[PDB]
Amino acid sequence: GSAKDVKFGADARALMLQGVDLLADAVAVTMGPKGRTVIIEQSWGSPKVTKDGVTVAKSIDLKDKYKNIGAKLVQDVANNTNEEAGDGTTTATVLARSIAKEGFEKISKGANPVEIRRGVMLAVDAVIAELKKQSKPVTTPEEIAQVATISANGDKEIGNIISDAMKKVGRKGVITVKDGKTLNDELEIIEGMKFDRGYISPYFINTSKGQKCEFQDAYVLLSEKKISSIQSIVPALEIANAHRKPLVIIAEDVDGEALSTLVLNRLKVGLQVVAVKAPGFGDNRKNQLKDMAIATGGAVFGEEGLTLNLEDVQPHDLGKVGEVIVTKDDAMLLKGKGDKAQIEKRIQEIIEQLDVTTSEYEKEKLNERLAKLSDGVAVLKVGGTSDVEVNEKKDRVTDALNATRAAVEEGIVLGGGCALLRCIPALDSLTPANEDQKIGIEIIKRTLKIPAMTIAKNAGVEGSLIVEKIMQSSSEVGYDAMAGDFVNMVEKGIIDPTKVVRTALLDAAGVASLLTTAEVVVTEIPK
Amino acid sequence: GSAKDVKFGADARALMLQGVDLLADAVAVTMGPKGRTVIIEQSWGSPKVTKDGVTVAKSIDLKDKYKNIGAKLVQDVANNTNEEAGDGTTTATVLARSIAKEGFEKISKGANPVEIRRGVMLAVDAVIAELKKQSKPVTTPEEIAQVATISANGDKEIGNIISDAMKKVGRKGVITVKDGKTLNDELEIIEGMKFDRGYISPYFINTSKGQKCEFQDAYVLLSEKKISSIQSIVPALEIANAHRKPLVIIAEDVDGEALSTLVLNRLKVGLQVVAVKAPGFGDNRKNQLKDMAIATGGAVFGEEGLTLNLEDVQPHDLGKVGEVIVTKDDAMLLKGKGDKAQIEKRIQEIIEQLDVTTSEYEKEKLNERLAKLSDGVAVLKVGGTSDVEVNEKKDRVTDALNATRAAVEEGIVLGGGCALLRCIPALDSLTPANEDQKIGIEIIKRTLKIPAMTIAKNAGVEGSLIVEKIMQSSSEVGYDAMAGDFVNMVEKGIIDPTKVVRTALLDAAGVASLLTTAEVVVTEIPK
Amino acid sequence: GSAKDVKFGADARALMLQGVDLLADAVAVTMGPKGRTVIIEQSWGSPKVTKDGVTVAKSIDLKDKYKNIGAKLVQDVANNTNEEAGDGTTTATVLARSIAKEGFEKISKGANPVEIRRGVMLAVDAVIAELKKQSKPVTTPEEIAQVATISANGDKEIGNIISDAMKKVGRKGVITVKDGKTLNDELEIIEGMKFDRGYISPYFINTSKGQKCEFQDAYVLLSEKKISSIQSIVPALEIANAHRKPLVIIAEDVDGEALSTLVLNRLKVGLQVVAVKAPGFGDNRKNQLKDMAIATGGAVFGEEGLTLNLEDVQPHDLGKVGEVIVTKDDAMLLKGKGDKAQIEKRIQEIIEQLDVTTSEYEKEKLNERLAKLSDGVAVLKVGGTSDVEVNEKKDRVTDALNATRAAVEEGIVLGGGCALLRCIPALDSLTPANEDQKIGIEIIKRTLKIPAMTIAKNAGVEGSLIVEKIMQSSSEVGYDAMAGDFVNMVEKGIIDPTKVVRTALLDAAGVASLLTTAEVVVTEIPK
Ligand SMILES: Nc1ncnc2c1ncn2[C@@H]1O[C@H](COP(=O)(O)OP(=O)(O)OP(=O)(O)O)[C@@H](O)[C@H]1O
Ligand SMILES: Nc1ncnc2c1ncn2[C@@H]1O[C@H](COP(=O)(O)OP(=O)(O)OP(=O)(O)O)[C@@H](O)[C@H]1O
Ligand SMILES: Nc1ncnc2c1ncn2[C@@H]1O[C@H](COP(=O)(O)OP(=O)(O)OP(=O)(O)O)[C@@H](O)[C@H]1O
Ligand SMILES: [K+]
Ligand SMILES: [K+]
Ligand SMILES: [K+]
Ligand SMILES: [Mg+2]
Ligand SMILES: [Mg+2]
Ligand SMILES: [Mg+2]
């Protein structure tokens, strides 16, 4: 319904290329070890300093709508690369700009850009097959540290701390990045079942040094329903007092009558009890209670299908731990006495629940449940003096974690853009179906030198000479742009994940080669 | 009541022709195998790349209201062609522009454009009769693959996957296109009675390998009313326990009492039961329940007319299945033991229900029920690396499905615009009533060369020489613009549906010949 | 989504440096004893005159977005230095401007600004280690007075009054600044437990000379619940009348029946009673009541876990005070007769509660409770003839308290910028890893003379000659810019807190060295 402007052919393609060139020229300055940063103004306060390609891409829009179309398409390239792999967005941006420029140069009257796109995709398939052929799996934690160090702009402390976290909680474990109140980065390992639910009554503290509740070899009473009646808590207290053992009551809530009974028996006769609210909101709360029951060797009272009531409690029905810490903010359970076979069965059930899930919010919850049933979670606290420093370093820590996970799942190739450089003879061994497919294959072949050229150009040297000397060298030798040397890349640690490289190439090609099929561009007339 | 501007004659016709010419020049670049794409800016995000004619047409509005009138009329041409046939909108746009231009050139003082319109419609009737005379029915799945390949811009994989879907679910079956999370396209065939309602309680899972409920040779209890009381569910459980067979209960819902009984019997004694909500949101829900009862050999309980009660259930009253799969999001019934004659009677009743409806939404539900009763449905998942490529390919998959259905229902003619080229002697055999009808017949005769000329022009060659060489050749010889040679069109697979060609010609002519009857154009003053 | 402007390299860096330079040039005029003030217009009335660096920094925003980015970054520096330390924001501003300018000058094609940042942070670590080596603890109240005098722009009366406050309530005690209605500053020491709730009924006044209620050796009845009934107040009156001793009833509230009984007993028969509302809203009210019970040797009635009722009150259950003062607005308790070891246990419990707190709102509440239990609080009332004068002097009093607290916790170094000047040989004893780290070390080395140069430049002398003559002198000799001569800084009292100096240096370096890594700046289009 709105009035439209319509452009045809080379003028529209030139304007779209100007937009692509602006966004890629702003992104490409951040590539490699000698890459620089981009300052983006935020409308609500302090500006953001970043070295992340998708962050620079997403934060650029142009007043010219023909240039903004190309900007949005390269934004789609960088965002798809960020979603699929979590790293390699700058590489994807420069590859997409190169494919778009070389495809725009090759459009003539007799050219068929759709067949050029077909040739581009065939060449990308060949290059991805070569990348999977030349990849090797990660088998040492030193390779993990090298991947996390390269992906964090040569920061060996971030690589070492990610390697330590992955040593402790496992290669497929849960690691969460957050900010820190200290100048230095730190790694905290949370083992057992720790959840962020504190006390219900402050009077339950029996360790005034840390203002916390401390028991050893304690009974555990787990309730799916909120414990309200006094008759629902008297037999459990009777068991816990007749056996002379502490009692941790984890429930949905505890009302005033049961709280008054617990606090009276704590402050008057000296009963070792503590009440903790059940973590979670909804079905995940019930799943976490079942996990705690299996880990502690108890049964959950208040079942909505089994109807287990709190008035007939047996000593075998109660779970057992060998240490519990209850703080005002959180509570943890240590060395639960649950049966190992049932714990393994619950772990297998969680793993099989992970196979059918697509919401990507239930997967995180299930992974957290699996981690709490296993060696635990790792928290990386990122240090700095200001919020802008912490955000800039946290983007790099997230990049290193994503690249390390991709290297774990799919292996490693040579870093520095040399992996794409070693795939050129696999395009030289290709027979095109026609001239347009040949044009597309040559477009991809010329594009395969772009990441190494950009990394060398950011280092202040002539990238074409560097790429020529890499291609004249052996297959193990590439260019260390940090030292400015020609080195064995595996022995020097410059390595990339295979997944990141192929994700960047595929996501750049699929959009740029479709952008180079256009003849007419329709925009709205600006108001 | 708004102030108006009024234009007379040749200036108004020139402005409307400028609008028609702009829209047709933006649409015509997408025609043929060597056609290109159009990028349309979307206001909310990523732009849209398309080769579809009606998408380019509908997305163009002009600030000049006199040009916008012609643009809206040729939009109506493309939209009517899309509604009737689902393909051929670019052909319709270029035919409409040709008729409008030739009719605007032929208006003089002594001319009668209404009689010119009469001659145009008479010529179009002659051409449509010739097209139906020269059409051939589709009798091989190879022709199906050829039609779907030509309609999907020469993609052989889309044509092959549509041919496989149409082999499996039938030539009049249900085939639904949707997006895919994988780079490649896939075809999923859903057989039996699968609906979008999963379980009710997660305790019914007896196969945790895929988090699903798995039974073989199960009883089915189907209820049109909600199952809430204990006495509504106890006799059915008694029958299922006495005969020692599983029981799936498909109802409107299951309230807490019956659900508690079902879960308690599932967990404690080990009763093989599962509860599923009835699919649908109204009358279609009851129709689907009746179809399930006929397919499974049972009866629907709680019927509004028959008044069947759940408190007196017989073993013959329950339906039977050979296998039922109940997952979290869907449930399916396989190998129903219903009577074949009643299934055929229900199928015939559904077929006769299709002949007395025109809402185009109940028709889809009736076709889905017919597919679930006889052959199942097919789902084409379209692959790509980004959403823009997925949408661009999904447009062509939809075009190929529409063209294949049109070819099934009405047959095929020659592709490449040669079918319209072979209808010119039929116009040479006509005798006009007067001079204006002769003018209209000549307008249609000159218009009939336009699609082949446009297809050859987009390929980079001179279209007039190509059209002359086609008309000088045999009736089976046309121009392969993809290979750029002169071939047997049927043997090379370059074929079109007759319905698409005649729909495009009729829809272009009816609006453009009425546009060429105008003398005064009234617009609003732009505020 | 908004249209963006993008700038590259030296032009963007020049604009950002222009913003940094304007903000630092407005802040730097306030540095040192001969610094001047800044008048900031306030939109709701009288302007604000200030000598505080963070106040000038926070109150400057620019219409040019590229200059505003640098202004916001130096504002972040000053705000961080204000939050961690409470002083030294002008020093941090000038250090940040120096690091930003020297880093912008050193960027070339072959330069790597990230490694330059690495060298900057390594040099700052060396300088902070040297500062901690050359620091000495505060051991005399004369040093406290000297620190508070230097931090209050040479006002020896503010330094003397802060030294007296820290003599009376301790160096870790609670000291609160507020305005005064008198031209001169004054210090008020509040001992005992004084809270903000006066009487309830005006008939309780037994000393009309000050309109106050005055008892000596009084019983104290504390209630956690609202005393409302006759039975809830009768036996306390019975024992206080049988022992012939006054009664102070501190409760949540007193309803009409109990209040009528108390007023009738006071007016008719002459009962020495007074009712006081319980200070606080929430858990802090209950904690203050427990503090008063431990201090007075009584028990809290109406406990939510102990359930102690007001109908069985014993003489030992009541607390005892040596003197109570009750006025209209406040009430205080003096010489409570509580057991000393329980008071010490409560004090240690409060101290251990202070170990785990992060809200920084409960921390001041716990500190106020600890002050009301150990040694009272100090209030500094700032004098002046107008509100602008009182605000300008209150800023300096707050600066002096913050610097005094930092000197208590972390020690002192030489004032006048000489402490940073004595850390230059510790950078001369550093071996850089490469050329860019050498550049960063030289940037910090040239930056270390900036505060002394600015202090000397504000005094009207040539700062470079002063800094050269300081560095040619002994390690104890600096420049008194107030007297304008070279003196012994420790013997003249010109000393700084170590924490303030290291906080300013670290906060300036961490942000300026990250600002000097930028190559692209993205701002929004000004609407
Ligand atoms: N010392 C080095 N010598 C040569 N190449 C290096 C060196 N360190 C890293 N690289 C290469 O530089 C690239 C990393 O660049 P960078 O991390 O800035 O961008 P990216 O991974 O494409 O995207 P993103 O901006 O999202 O992180 C990789 O190809 C990596 O192999
Ligand atoms: N290889 C070929 N050689 C010659 N003509 C071809 C070839 N492939 C397809 N055609 C012809 O090109 C036309 C298809 O063009 P296209 O599908 O772009 O437009 P359309 O059907 O008019 O509209 P729509 O945009 O809705 O698909 C048909 O007439 C078809 O017969
Ligand atoms: N008489 C003096 N001679 C020399 N230097 C002095 C003298 N008095 C104070 N100084 C120095 O001047 C500096 C104090 O400056 P000023 O208090 O104005 O700013 P600041 O501490 O950087 O920040 P803020 O504006 O937040 O107070 C300190 O370095 C102090 O040692
Ligand atoms: K980057
Ligand atoms: K088309
Ligand atoms: K100052
Ligand atoms: Mg990276
Ligand atoms: Mg088509
Ligand atoms: Mg100061």
Swiss-Prot record, chains A, B, C:
Predominant location category: mitochondrion
In-chain residues carrying the UniProt-annotated modification N6-acetyllysine: 51, 58, 63, 67, 101, 106, 109, 132, 167, 178, 181, 194, 212, 225-226, 245, 268, 290, 328, 335, 365, 372, 445, 457
Subcellular localization: Mitochondrion matrix
Catalysed reactions listed for this entry: ATP + H2O + a folded polypeptide = ADP + phosphate + an unfolded polypeptide
Gene3D superfamilies the UniProt entry points to: GroEL (3.50.7.10), GroEL-like equatorial domain (1.10.560.10), TCP-1-like chaperonin intermediate domain (3.30.260.10)
Keywords, alphabetical: Acetylation, ATP-binding, Chaperone, Disease variant, Hereditary spastic paraplegia, Host-virus interaction, Isomerase, Isopeptide bond, Leukodystrophy, Mitochondrion, Neurodegeneration, Nucleotide-binding, Phosphoprotein, Transit peptide, Ubl conjugation
UniProt cross-references to CDD domains, sorted A to Z: GroEL
The protein's role, per its UniProt record: Chaperonin implicated in mitochondrial protein import and macromolecular assembly. Together with Hsp10, facilitates the correct folding of imported proteins. May also prevent misfolding and promote the refolding and proper assembly of unfolded polypeptides generated under stress conditions in the mitochondrial matrix. The functional units of these chaperonins consist of heptameric rings of the large subunit Hsp60, which function as a back-to-back double ring.
PANTHER family hit by this protein: 60 KDA HEAT SHOCK PROTEIN, MITOCHONDRIAL
HAMAP family assigned: CH60
Assembly and binders: Homoheptamer arranged in a ring structure. The functional units of these chaperonins consist of heptameric rings of the large subunit Hsp60, which function as a back-to-back double ring. Interacts with 2 heptameric Hsp10 rings to form the symmetrical football complex. Interacts with HRAS. Interacts with ATAD3A. Interacts with ETFBKMT and EEF1AKMT3. Interacts with MFHAS1.
Protein name: 60 kDa heat shock protein, mitochondrial
